[PDB]
Amino acid sequence: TLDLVNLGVAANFAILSKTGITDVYKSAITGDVGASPITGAAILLKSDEVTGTIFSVDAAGPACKITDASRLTTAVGDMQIAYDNAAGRLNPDFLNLGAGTIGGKTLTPGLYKWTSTLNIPTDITISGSSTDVWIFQVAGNLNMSSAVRITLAGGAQAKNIFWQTAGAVTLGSTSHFEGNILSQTGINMKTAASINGRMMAQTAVTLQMNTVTIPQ
Ligand SMILES: [Cl-]
Ligand SMILES: [Cl-]
Numbered sequence: 001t002l003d004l005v006n007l008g009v010a011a012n013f014a015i016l017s018k019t020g021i022t023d024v025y026k027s028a029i030t031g032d033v034g035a036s037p038i039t040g041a042a043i044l045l046k047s048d049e050v051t052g053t054i055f056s057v058d059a060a061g062p063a064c065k066i067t068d069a070s071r072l073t074t075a076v077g078d079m080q081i082a083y084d085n086a087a088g089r090l091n092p093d094f095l096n097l098g099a100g101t102i103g104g105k106t107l108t109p110g111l112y113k114w115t116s117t118l119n120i121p122t123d124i125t126i127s128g129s130s131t132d133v134w135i136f137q138v139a140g141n142l143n144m145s146s147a148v149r150i151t152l153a154g155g156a157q158a159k160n161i162f163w164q165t166a167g168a169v170t171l172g173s174t175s176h177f178e179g180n181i182l183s184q185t186g187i188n189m190k191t192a193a194s195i196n197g198r199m200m201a202q203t204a205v206t207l208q209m210n211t212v213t214i215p216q
């Protein structure tokens with residue numbers, strides 16, 4: 001059975017980036033948010049958008065920010081460790097499933113790899129037990145089209161789903177994502193898309209009136 005990806009201190013964040021968090025008011029984020037090593041001024045959220053704590057590396061940022069460089073440095077390091085962990089998993093159960101487009105599929109537990117960009121243009125289901133683990137390795141971008149829902153079935157839990165992407169992630173408007181995202185570049189959400197999962201970007205996270213909830 002596939003091991004979880006240990007997020008370390010990054011597990012405590014709904015959104016964690018390295019070059020900031022952009023936002024088209026109003027979003028609704030549940031969980032802590034942070035960015036490092038960029039200045040906290042690059043976190044463009046307000047306090048009424050975040051249920052939790054906004055962490056900054058310095059004295060800049062939203063009014064409600066907490067300055068804690070050492071925690072952010074550990075979280076971002078742990079985020080990098082998790083990204084490398086997840087990208088380093090060997091012996092995939094699936095390789096280039098659906099030839100890079102996977103609309104309509106039901107995904108069972110395991111390690112999946114794509115040597116291209118992955119597209120999700122219609123609804124999909126992730127199906128498994130409450131202890132099963134999915135790891136999706138994407139060597140290109142990860143795209144999901146407008147209004148696409150990812151449905152969880154059989155007891156599958158968002159906290160046991162990990163998406164590792166070497167390129168940028170784009171979630172289209174009204175879409176609904178499930179699982180943790182470890183992006184090597186950005187994670188870009190569009191108008192009123194939602195995610196039950198974490199947004200861990202090694203560049204920036206950009207939002208447009210999104211709902212972001214940390215997995216329970
Ligand atoms: Cl850092
Ligand atoms: Cl990769």
Ligand SMILES: [Cl-]
Pocket residue numbers: 190
């Ligand atoms: Cl846009």
